[PDB]
């Protein structure tokens, strides 16, 4: 029937975790027959599929591992540790710290309104700071026709270069090459993420 | 996947001084560390310190205690180290890593695991 | 400090072989055991975490064992992609520390 190996060490039942870190719970136990392990989350079924990036099991060490841990893995987890003859459980209550995101914040270029001549290089420079990632987009305000503006709230543009921003800094470029009548016009940098988004309008005229 | 790119290394001579910065990806910067850890042309790995998290407290091989000095600013998402006082057998290829924590109330340590690696930056000090 | 000491410091095998290296430390560091994988001007890459725990994307062809003071690193069919350098550190301490390396090289 089964019981703890160490019950000294199982005293200890809160852990928090900075986001990102990885945790371990532990349930070491013994018996004849050597018991099943299974693991609840706030008392329910808990799987891999219940959280992306999964989880990690290992019975023959009595662990359960979840890497990469996030807010929402904020809960109780309870190990139930089971033969024939009998049961024994334990229940951790996991806190998950992180700090909560904001919008993008934008930085124009010192030029930016800009004039130039038929045949010369210009370029648009946009600092995007964003703590959550950022899809950065440089757009054109165009027109469909005589549509500086389209039947609803909604300056017509279209989309002149895109990413996925991969660090919470980056300097996004526009680089308009030998420059022609037709490249004049409105620009603009715009950021978003989760929490919504930032912009600036750079203006040329050929 | 984190990237990392360290950069400041070249040539110095003894006794002075170089930083180095290490340049991170990502989004979790602040919750998690980096560590340092050197490699001297034909040799093994020899770890030089950690700050973690990186608003956090620094730790640092004997080798180095009182010379090097590890920093972050976390609003670039870049760590430093600062070397003083340098000799010849710091020479070596400085490594900066992402550094997180595997946590268990089971056990009285937390393992530090250093899983993304940065390309490296060339430290000679020689005069 | 704790002292890992690595075995062999280098072997030749052919792909297909079943490859087995050891790690011993000086003293108990428990499961605080992580390995890597060095080629020749790169960064090391890492395999293994708390003596036997895959991370993530690592082919399961490479598994770890052992606890206290006696740490194996297996990979159970070699691949040509394998031959490179392995190194086991300790975390169970402040400072972590490195065993020396181990060369897998090819056989011919």
């Known amino acids: 029937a089964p019981y703890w190996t160490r019950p000294e060490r199982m005293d200890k039942k809160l852990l928090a975790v900075p986001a990102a870190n990885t945790v371990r719970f532990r349930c070491p136990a013994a018996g004849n027959p050597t018991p099943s392990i299974s693991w609840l989350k706030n008392g329910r079924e808990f799987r891999g599929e219940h959280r992306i990036g999964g989880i990690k099991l290992r019975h023959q060490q009595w662990s359960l591992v979840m890497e990469s841990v996030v807010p929402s893995d904020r809960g109780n987890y309870t190990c139930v540790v089971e033969n024939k003859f009998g049961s024994i459980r334990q229940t951790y209550t996991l806190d998950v710290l992180e700090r909560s995101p904001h919008r993008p914040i934008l930085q124009a270029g010192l030029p930016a309104n800009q004039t130039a001549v038929l045949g010369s290089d210009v370029e648009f420079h946009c600092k995007v700071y964003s703590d959550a990632q950022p899809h950065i987009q440089w757009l054109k305000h165009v027109e469909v026709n005589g549509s500086k503006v389209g039947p609803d709230g909604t300056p017509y543009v279209t989309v002149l270069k895109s990413w996925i921003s991969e660090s919470v800094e980056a300097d996004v470029r526009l680089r308009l090459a030998n420059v022609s009548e037709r490249d004049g016009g409105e620009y603009l940098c715009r950021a978003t993420n989760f929490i919504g988004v930032a912009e600036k309008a750079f203006w040329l005229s050929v | 996947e984190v990237q990392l790119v360290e950069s400041g290394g070249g040539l110095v001579q003894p006794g002075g001084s170089l930083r180095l910065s290490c340049a991170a990806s990502?989004?979790?910067?602040?919750?998690?560390?980096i560590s340092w850890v050197r490699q001297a042309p034909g040799k093994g790995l020899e770890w030089v310190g950690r700050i973690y998290p990186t608003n956090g407290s620094t730790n640092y091989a004997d080798s180095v205690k009182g010379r090097f000095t590890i920093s972050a600013d976390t609003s670039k998402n870049t760590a430093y180290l600062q070397m003083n006082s340098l000799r010849a057998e710091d020479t070596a290829v400085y490594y900066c890593?992402?550094?997180?924590?595997?946590?268990?109330?089971?056990?009285?340590?937390?393992?530090?695991?250093?899983?993304?690696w940065g390309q490296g930056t060339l430290v000679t000090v020689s005069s | 400090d704790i002292q890992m000491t690595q075995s062999p410091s280098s072997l030749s095998a052919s792909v297909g072989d079943r490859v087995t290296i050891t790690c011993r430390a000086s003293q108990d560091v428990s499961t605080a055991v992580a390995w890597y994988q060095q080629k020749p001007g790169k960064a090391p890459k890492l395999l293994i975490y708390?003596?036997?725990f895959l991370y993530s994307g690592v082919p399961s062809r490479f598994s770890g064992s052992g606890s206290g003071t006696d740490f194996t690193l297996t990979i159970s069919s070699l691949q040509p992609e394998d031959f490179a350098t392995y190194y086991c550190?300790?975390?169970?301490?402040?400072?972590?520390?490195f065993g020396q390396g181990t060369k897998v090289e090819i056989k011919r």
């Open positions: 708390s003596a036997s």
């Open positions: 890593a992402r550094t997180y924590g595997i946590y268990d109330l089971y056990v009285d340590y937390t393992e530090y695991v250093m899983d993304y």
């Open positions: 550190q300790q975390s169970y301490t402040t400072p972590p520390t």
């Open positions: 990502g989004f979790t910067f602040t919750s998690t560390g």
